[PDB]
Amino acid sequence: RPRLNRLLVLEEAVRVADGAGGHRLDWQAKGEVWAEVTAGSGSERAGEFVTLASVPFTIVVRAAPVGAARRPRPEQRFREGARIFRILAVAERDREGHYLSCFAREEVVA
Amino acid sequence: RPRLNRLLVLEEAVRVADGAGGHRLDWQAKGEVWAEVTAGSGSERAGEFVTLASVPFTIVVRAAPVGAARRPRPEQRFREGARIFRILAVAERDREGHYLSCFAREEVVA
Amino acid sequence: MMLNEVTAVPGTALPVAEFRDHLRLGTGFADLGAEDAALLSYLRAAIAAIEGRTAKALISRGFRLALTAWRWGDMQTLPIAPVATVTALRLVDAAGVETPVAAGWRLVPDMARPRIEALGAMLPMIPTGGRVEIDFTAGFGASWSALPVDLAQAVFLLAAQYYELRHDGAAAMPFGVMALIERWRTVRVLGGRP
Amino acid sequence: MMLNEVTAVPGTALPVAEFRDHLRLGTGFADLGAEDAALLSYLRAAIAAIEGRTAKALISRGFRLALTAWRWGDMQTLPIAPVATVTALRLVDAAGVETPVAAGWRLVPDMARPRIEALGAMLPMIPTGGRVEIDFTAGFGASWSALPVDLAQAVFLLAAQYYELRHDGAAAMPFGVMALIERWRTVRVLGGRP
């Protein structure tokens, strides 16, 4: 069972809609979770005009019902200091349902 | 746990900006780290007009906080003599956080 | 010695609303979907497994202990251990005249060896053929909250196990089900004539 | 010898807000209270597990020790170990009359042998057919801070376990749950008559 050791400031953006239909994100902070962060095989990835450096980072937190504040939705991102971990998906790692796998990137521009 | 045996001269380039927006790199040396270099499956790769020979080379060093000189950022490259190891990403290999996986290329023109 | 229960539990005394919280509260899928009356059928199966291994009663149900001959001269240890207040020690004869007694005995309560332990050396003798019969109320308390909480956790560790996996499938905890029970089992070393 | 509790722990004396810091739930969420109903359900289930393996008390709730015959002529070692200020050895009669007795009994404090030795070479006699209940408040302290901290840690090592696995699922530490408990268990080597 996972050994949780990092403090990840979970962050959810409020979506202020603009006139054209596109929302504007704020990334106001949410309450902090505890998690383990297990790396994957990382390599740099061609962005737009940026040679973005990415690593897979399966993050494991504890669980909650889907209508609770403690669930990381894939809308949200983690942030440890200045290292933003995006959330690709959340997937309910444990069999009994105690732990959630998340999926991250840590795309540093490099 | 990794057995560190190579001396890798870590190198960081200062970015002298030119008039057009592009920085000019210098690759001034930084202090030397100790590391292990574990090879991957290597094969030659089609460059521009060069048949570049590459090997994956997961390099493992010790860790530091992200605002420290001892962290290899993916901006930087290693260099052992005349063998430059680029850094693709850094990924915090250990569970407790003592060791960092790096990711290299060693693209020799061949 | 039949020792049938007079009345069972009401069912509303059992912590079905709390066992749903021991099943998935604070971590889980959601409250999720559990057949409510199914969850009552696993608590009654886990209590009746711990009522048998510990020889306790846990809900304070009413009992009826109808046995023919007194084992000792006066002692008569009661099997279901946490007792309180003999309802009646009525004494039926071979035809069924059912003449109760109201004195001559003083129940000495104890979690280890509950007794009847009559006054002096005379315990009510038995009509030939006419079984003696003792009605008593044995258990901790009327509600679930009056229990020792370590014994209550052994129900929840066990009733959840009957919920999590149905057939007899294979799967060493420090205070597991078995380690929470052993300070409530009856430790006996007599295999003798008294 | 029945040894029931007069009053339970208040629940507000249990460190639910510190046990939540132990289990790494979450720091600044707006909910923060979905687990309060269950976290103290496992703290009461882990204290009561360690209260039985150690024969200690840990919150200094009041007890009632209702017994009938004295175990030894004068000593009467009490089961729940860390005691202070035995309130009342009220001597009930065969039926009814309860007369509290100063009686010339002392109290010898100890974590290992909490005796109630008498000074007149004989404890107050017992009316035949009547019990002698002793009210006493036994435990380390009133609040959670007055505990020995290693025993307080053994609750947190154990109640975190019940929170992380619900049913009896099997899963070596230097000072684990068990190695912290063992300097608080009762070490006895007498199976004899006296």
Next chain:
Amino acid sequence: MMLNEVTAVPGTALPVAEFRDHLRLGTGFADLGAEDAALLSYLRAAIAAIEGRTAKALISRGFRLALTAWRWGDMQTLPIAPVATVTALRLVDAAGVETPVAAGWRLVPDMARPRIEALGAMLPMIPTGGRVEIDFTAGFGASWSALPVDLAQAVFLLAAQYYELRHDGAAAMPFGVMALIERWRTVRVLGGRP
């Protein structure tokens, strides 16, 4: 023999600022985020696990050793081992007259067997019922820096373990926690009458 502490540690005497450095300094995530007062609650749990296995004191807290009868004729080995300067050997009687003594005994300090070892063969006798009571200050030094550093490392090897993993999860080091403790345990081979 109750042996309750008079005062606990202040908390500000503990090396919380240093234990953050033994947790993650020179290698790590960053200073990272650790509930500061949580880290104080694992040092008090690791010291109290090593104060019990070694029977040492480590912070030089004040003690109160109130026992009824002298074990030997004169010796009276003190349990908490590194001692200095008996505060008082006041002697209360059965009513509480609390008449201290100021001579007749000379504490012989030692890390192995601290004693009281009165002068000649006469150690202050006990009023019948009136427990004797000894207040002393036992431990190495007032600050954390006065400790033997190998024993201090056994706290940091243990308090980090309670920080790194919460429940009782499984995981042989040459000088581990156990190998640093064994030269501070009490080696006794008496199970006898003296």
Next chain:
Amino acid sequence: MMLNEVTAVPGTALPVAEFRDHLRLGTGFADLGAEDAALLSYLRAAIAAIEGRTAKALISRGFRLALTAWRWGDMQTLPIAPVATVTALRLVDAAGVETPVAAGWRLVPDMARPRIEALGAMLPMIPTGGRVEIDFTAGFGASWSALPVDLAQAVFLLAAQYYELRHDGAAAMPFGVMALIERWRTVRVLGGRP
């Protein structure tokens, strides 16, 4: 027999700049000093581990051996083994007066038996109720270079281990930590009276 240290090691005598070369931190960084506060925290924690397993001293700090009765009629073997130039056997009195005594005592240097044998067939007598503290400076040398190098390596094999794993996590060498220590431990086979 208390055996405390008068002065500790200075800290500047410890080879922190050479231990950093051992652990492969880094050569030419501009920071170079983020670990200095912790590297000597593990060197003092590994020397004090080997000072107890070997009963050696290694930095030749000054000691104070405060004892009361002589272990044998004349010999008095000192615990900390590599000694030189016992300063003072000042004989304190029952209370107060401290009279240093030349006393006709010798010193027999040895790494195994650092005796203090007396020449007049009897060491200076001890005022009943008073201690005899002995100031002596025991160790290999003043600086780190005067050590036996294999024992200096056993500090570097051990303090590197504490730097690489923080808590007690389990993880066979020909000359490991233990096999370098064993020619410096004390080999004793007496459990007798003399």
Next chain:
Amino acid sequence: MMLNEVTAVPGTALPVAEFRDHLRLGTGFADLGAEDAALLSYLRAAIAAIEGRTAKALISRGFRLALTAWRWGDMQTLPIAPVATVTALRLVDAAGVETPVAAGWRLVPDMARPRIEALGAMLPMIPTGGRVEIDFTAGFGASWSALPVDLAQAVFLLAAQYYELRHDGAAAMPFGVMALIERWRTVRVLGGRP
């Protein structure tokens, strides 16, 4: 019997330039980068591990053997085995008159049991209190090339091991470190009075 070395190695006598070749010559990364004075600090740690297990000396350093009483009547086996030419057998008295002797003894050299073995049965007696003191030069040769090369390879197999891995990490060779040492260890079967 202190047996401190008079002078250590110069450091320039050690084969640091050759040990760089045993580390990576003919196969390797390149000459690579090795802290030169670090490599001298692992040769001094591997020699001092083999000087202790074999009781040899290997560099022919100067020794000073200052012991109080002669063990036999005349024999006096010297511990550090390959010896040559006693420098002096000066004899100090209890005050320090330091009167050397120049005849009466003939060192009998041998790699097994080097001796002093005085002429006849009279070996220089000891002034009461005045320790005898023997200065000798023990070892194979002044340079590294004068050694038995199998013993020199046991240094290089061991000093490379301290270079290749720092902490005490786990990892049966036919002629390993241990198999090259065993023909240079001292084989003794006496545990007796002579």
